[PDB]
Amino acid sequence: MSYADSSRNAVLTNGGRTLRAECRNADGNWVTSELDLDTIIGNNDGHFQWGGQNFTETAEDIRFHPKEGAAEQPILRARLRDCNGEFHDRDVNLNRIQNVNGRLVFQ
């Protein structure tokens, strides 16, 4: 499924630039993994782009929701600024992020 399947203590850090979460590895051990969103997440005029990087420079009000309601769906929403210079709150499915033996990687 995703890293969320075996992740906890998932909170955004650095102002929504770092995704910190504790995910179990292939052995079952809980590993604290951190993925710089700003390193693999981009904002395309109000649209999250997996593999963009530097989205935080055009993103504001970044709030991470690892376990959304009873759905426990990891989604990240923030205000995405467009090339014109406006802002529109968007949301992205962090389910793309999986855990490989104790590491967080986007897919």
Curated annotation (Swiss-Prot):
Assigned protein family: Belongs to the cyanovirin-N family.
Protein name per the record: Cyanovirin-N homolog
Domain of life: Eukaryota
Residue span relative to the full protein: 42 to 95 of 111
Function summary: Mannose-binding lectin.
